């Protein structure tokens, strides 16, 4: 995927596909920040090409922005464009901001002069700073060469102070000529004016891609207030259509869905292919417009994924394209654990590789949310059957989180859903799995990943906790099938396996045109030993949600200390279910047993 | 297979599989040397575990031996064991011999005292001294073997002291014992127990010499003072003059001896070929140890793997030297790092110069004209290629060997391309997950699945080339590279980077991908490909119709490679070219 | 360019830019041509240039003399210096020019010096001209009362380490077209065709458009072999195993040759500007023997 | 220039690509009116035009092709049948089209005219044999029909032109069923826009078109007023076109019936007509 926004815009203009971005701003509460990170991560699944983060005046604001960029690039896996102004900005401040964004893994900056502070009417340049945004574009270009792609502001309805169309487009030519790759415009509601303006920009020999600022409608108040503040031309037809239901913001949102989307359709018709949405840290207004454009992912046009796992865009992780299967559902975790790696694995895991894998606590690979909340989610299990139930509920999308998954139940699971439900009801508590795939088109809605016109493959994988009573019988049965390889381990330390070497076993791979074989998912011993400690720790952190001496707490602590964790690979990828069949009929003893405290 | 012979012998003794080796000697004529290299390369297909090369006393013998080792390891791809004596041998001479073998890639030496042309130039007295010398010099790099004598030494006939000296040589750090030829089997298997009785545990390797003539049999046997059974004598007596009857008798005589050695648990057989295939071959067939369709020769990789100096780890190559193995080795020989596991994007490989590396046509011009005749027009060339495809002729400029069986799938499609003037130099059919034991497509570990993208590479007239390019671009699954001798390069590639065209999924293992296609490599190949066609032209006289035709052709024709990234449908590639034909196939050039 | 009066060349009035400074050479190479190009180069034209080794024209005078002129370069900076000396009229010959530095260069003299001092060794160039009077003392050619035009051209050797960055920068400008090539063979380009691109043309009264200078792929491929050969013949002036000899032979085997046309003739120096900031690594490095 | 290549580049760029089918009128007057109308419609910017071939009409068609190619500057595709056509008639027709500069070709019982052809597959093969690859050739129980389509295509046709339809779902289904049979050539839908309520229903019923009840219901109230019917049937047909276009089929072939306005209104509705904003491009002054 292109890292420079100019390239993304260009290939968007070429393919004609749905291309869009989300602008967010730094909130004041650290709470609002967490909510925003969650909202960002949900909106990620809409599938933007990039996001923006705005840059205020204020010391906290400047630091928060830089921290938010790191978060977005490394963990949320969202290609970010950090805004940067000359408002209260010494050159030392600018070089700091830029160095932070650099080390985040960011490759996109929006070079602005900036609105004045909340103290200030007039924009005064901070001493040893820049006068114009043209000066900052040239500054970035000189400092970091062509590492950062630079975007700049544009004004189809004129600047707030400046209403000379001709000289404004001249200074736009200046800012662009200093080495900007693209223009992002202010919000507008007069479309004809915009598409006129676009020709007048091109008339002046300004060739760069233009990106319209779309602000969708959320409330009638916020719509009119922001629009009037920025002095937007709103059509009387828009006014007249919103007038009757002005109080009802449900009716206004379902109206302003189609008003804004009609404007977008005419922008899109005109050949302009990218839409930049001002979310205001809100999903729904944007989401409704994206649905109105059928740009949200469907069965018909499913969401494109680079790899079978959520790829990091952290500093130096651009080349990372192979991981163990074990953090399939704990992406952020793997990132946390591997963050201090000098070299990321690339193309193959390889035999000599001895990985490090971090420390659990000191990296924040723990529980999400309060204990009070997690008890609300999971209740108070007294016996092993209650845990089974909880897993079955997750599998049926009834609850959304379990300790061993960052997210709700996958669609890849929804193939083998009832097989895994059956395993859980028998006490084989399944943490992780994947079905076998024998050469599905790389655009498959469920199995697809990577470049177009490929073929993808997977070996069947299954990973579960089992009672030490039952474990022997499972081991026996697994060894009695030649295609199966396993690794089994206890919290205690003990490790059993029938593996023929230490070296990694490929479990997901793809053949693509013009390219070497992609092999993004492996299984490997050292990695599994890193994973098992996390896996037991998560179940123990779950126990710690409950009061000391609880039936819940004792149950879970017991479970973790005494149960095995078994992974199984079916090296036959022609027939995947062999592994679900081999386990049929086995059940754990004392599913209903409560461990007594008297 | 493990580089050290002791490990091979041990796992042979364990599995019980067919394990055997071939001993050869340095000939005096450089011709006999070339014949031997050819014979070696044929016998390679029998599938030995290793070969031996004997060491004579003389100076040029010492140099020839070292040259032969390099040849065998790097180019013929045969794990060699170099013999080394203390006959006429200064320590400087020994250290030189060892350094040569080292740099060959060799990991196996047979440490001998040596027959005379026995203290020479104050070297070593006994072979025990040389075993210890090698061990001290090169540590555990060389696995060392030593001689053994089940019927006694010629001069030395005290069996008890002999086994004591054997214990000495072994205790200096030998990994295995290779015996002299014998024909008394009972004596041998008795001897084996007497060796073990003396606390000599190493693997024993019997010296088997099969029968080729009645004369050479009896002469060598009497010279070594072999006990020949009266039953052997009596069976060979009536047809003694007829060496065809003697060879088909002594096939079964020797093989019966081998069967009793094999029964006894001794699993490796070392054949004294005397630089002759047939005598050994008949015994190996008698033991059904020679490969069949039913039990084919296993291939590690889709191409002949080198055992050269830094080439044990080499497991990825361009497709373009599929049929010029020795050449690729010659060109890449000065590489400090060989590619392993993947080719990778960063790799900028510096291939060797054509002339500087002896990457040319085989045999005399007089001979090559005999093979290929005198082409006057493009149709004659077409005919020659069709003849190769039908196994009627055995060599073309662009192939070290005769036509593949992998070709016999798409045989008629390639014939049709050639008859239309699209002269095909290289190809492979698409394979969609053949079991790794497929008799044709199989390679690599057992219970795998192998895959291939269809590949096609051919010369085409510059008149027709435009139409071909157009057609190829009109197919999304096809990628090509086209180039002229002149320099010009066209392509529809999305990248510089390598494209995988052969790959394998194995259990417990990362994906194997031994064959790729890549731009820089293709540019190295194109120069070779035009040069070979030009060297072909140089076979003919200066002003010739043949010469002018070929030189013209090479200077002015394109070379097109095409990958079909669809491996579900392979013939797509042959179909999309159907109906195109080069303009004046029968035209003879007037020389003006 | 210097017009030939050879047997069938009275009508020859279009040539590639590449032998702008090697006239005699172009004549030698094209001597066996049945038809000399006239009025336009044309798309169909498949030109068969002469073989270097077959002989023609190469380096001038003795090795002893050429070493006297050019000295003994040990590193890439010494070569840079020599080119800067040529540009400042201090030395009179370099391998890639039959003659001393042009006056047309003396417009863009400082720009080309700056490219050389950065290790981008410039073998050929021309500034953009937007309708100079056909009597201009520097740019003038052809009939009186005309107007002449030129697209900016630039051609230089660059280290294979730096070449990627150059390619990136060139592709990031829409008005630029390039062709890049290695001695090895490899050819990169962003051209939309094989066909010739006009880089010098003139409007005259009572006359059809004159277009004497073009840029074209097949011709560039003929030229690149000459260009590397000249640098190699320079290396052969020195003793085998020399620091000079090894330096030059290395350079030629491993460096790219990039030509660039700026199809904007309204803004000419844009070509010299877009390459600002690039520099070759190890300018002072001596290759150890 | 070969229509198959034009259709392919159209499918690639996704731009506006469309053609106009005309028929030979009986009056020489109607012919002059048509040449004028052709020349006006030229400015809409079609990629090519078609001229239909009756029994005759044969002579007029050939004259009209010359006119269109040489003077009006419009790339023409001449239709050619096997109806009342000896092989000498066919070779004549083809030689005329050849000399025009054309590079594109498409009783009670149908009785094959003696020493001519039975099927169109035979004529496709005939053209291919006679004129090599000079002419690009187009062609017109669902299972056996698509078998014969495979035959006609396999004889060396570059593209398929369909009959008029008003059932869109049926069409896009059919397209997949064609491709299912290994018939890969570019498809060109037959679009016939609406000019009058009478001509619409009459021609549609004659060809036995499925007309949607929604189309019927929308045209019912203003059936007498053909101004209202034309501004309605503008958007009816154009909606059908939009769904064909969305599906990746990028060329639209309009049955003009020698009339500009019906087609023109649909092309405007698709903003496929040139504007000031996107003017008609000129190769030369
Ligand atoms: C998508 C987007 C996001 C933004 N995000 C932020 C943000 O996060 N934080 C923030 O502070 N600001 C942000 N802004 C910008 C900000 O609110 C103001 O609009 C800004 O002060 C002016 O725009 P500029 O930064 O492009 O200025 P510049 O173009 O560098 O300079 C602005 C000044 O130059 C003047 N000018 C015009 N022509 C000439 C000329 N020929 N010569 C000299 N000067 C001339 C203008 O009239 C104006 O007074 C954003 C703008 C956009 C479009
Ligand atoms: C497989 C094989 C390959 C051969 N290849 C070659 C070849 O390539 N070139 C060649 O010239 N010859 C070759 N020969 C012949 C062999 O090298 C000679 O027969 C050799 O001299 C025998 O000695 P040895 O190598 O076994 O070593 P040693 O056993 O060290 O030879 C020493 C001899 O002296 C006696 N002896 C006396 N005192 C001692 C003592 N203290 N310790 C040890 N031995 C003592 C031994 O009984 C023995 O006869 C080969 C023989 C075999 C079996
Ligand atoms: C786009 C288009 C253009 C038209 N152009 C003309 C024109 O120029 N002139 C004209 O007079 N009319 C034209 N018509 C109408 C019509 O084609 C004629 O009236 C007349 O009926 C000619 O043949 P056809 O319609 O049967 O078509 P065709 O498709 O040409 O019918 C013959 C083909 O149908 C198949 N076929 C039919 N019956 C059989 C069978 N029994 N066995 C095997 N295969 C069979 C074969 O593949 C054969 O090649 C056109 C219609 C359309 C939709």
Author numbering:
A (entry chain C): -1 to 596
B (entry chain D): -1 to 115, 122 to 596
C (entry chain A): 307 to 595
D (entry chain B): 1 to 56, 59 to 108, 118 to 151, 162 to 306
Original authors' sentences:
Methylenetetrahydrofolate reductase (MTHFR) is a pivotal flavoprotein connecting the folate and methionine methyl cycles, catalyzing the conversion of methylenetetrahydrofolate to methyltetrahydrofolate. The eukaryotic form of MTHFR is homodimeric, where each monomer consists of the N-terminal catalytic domain connected by a linker to the C-terminal regulatory domain. In addition, AdoMet acts as an allosteric regulator of MTHFR and a feedback loop regulator in folate and methionine metabolism. Here, we report crystal structures of Chaetomium thermophilum MTHFR (cMTHFR) in both active (R) and inhibited (T) states.
As such, a mutant (cMTHFRE21Q, L393M, V516F) was used instead, along with reductive methylation of surface-exposed lysine residues to aid in crystallization. The construct was successfully crystallized, and its structure was solved to 3.4 Å in the active R-state. Electron density for FAD was observed in every catalytic active site. Although electron density consistent with AdoHcy was found in the regulatory domain, it was weak and could not be faithfully modeled. Even so, the homodimer assembly was found to display the same dimer interface mediated by the regulatory domain, a β-sheet sandwich consistent with the one previously observed for AdoHcy-bound hMTHFR (R-state)7. The catalytic domains were also found to face “away” from the dimer interface and each other and are not interacting with one another, in stark contrast to the direct role they play in dimerization in bacterial MTHFRs. In this active R-state, the si-face of FAD is unoccluded in the active site and forms an extended hydrogen-bonding network between N5 of FAD centered on conserved residues His81 and Asp50 (His127 and Asp92 in hMTHFR), along with a strong hydrogen bond between the universally conserved Thr52 (Thr94 in hMTHFR) and O4 of FAD. Given that the active site is solvent exposed and that access to FAD is unoccluded, the captured structure likely represents a catalytically-competent form of the enzyme in the active R-state, much like that observed for hMTHFR. When the linker between the catalytic and regulatory domains is retracted, Arg315 can interact with Glu318 and Thr336 in this active state.
